[PDB]
Amino acid sequence: YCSDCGADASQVRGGYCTNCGASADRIR
Ligand SMILES: [Co+2]
């Protein structure tokens, strides 16, 4: 999940969370 917004990890693309724009490393 994205620690910043809670989006499912499947929503990360291009090095960012596609919901909140968090950088990749915020995924946990
Ligand atoms: Co996010």
- Would you tell me how many other CB atoms lie within 10 Å of the CB of residue 14? 7
**Quick one: resolution in A?**
1.8
Q: Which two tokens stand for residue 21?
A: 């724009």
- Per the DSSP assignment, residues forming a β-bridge with 16 are 13, 23
Closest CA to 27 of 14, 19, 17: 17
Ligand 1 centre and the CA of 18: distance in Å?
7
- Per the DSSP assignment, residues forming a β-bridge with 17 are 12
- Residue 27 near residue 10, CB atoms below 8 Å: no
Domain ranges of the chain: 1-28
d(CA 14, CA 16): 6
Experimental technique, in short, is: X-ray
Residues with CB under 5 A from ligand 1 (ion): 2, 4-5, 7, 17, 19-20, 22
Q: How would you write 1-28 as a 3-class SS string? A: CECCCCCCHHHEECCEECCCCCEHHHEC
Q: What is the CA radius of gyration of the chain?
A: 7
User: What is each CA distance from 18 to 4, 11, 14, 22, in whole angstroms?
Assistant: 12, 6, 9, 8
Ligand 1 centre and the CA of 8: distance in Å?
8
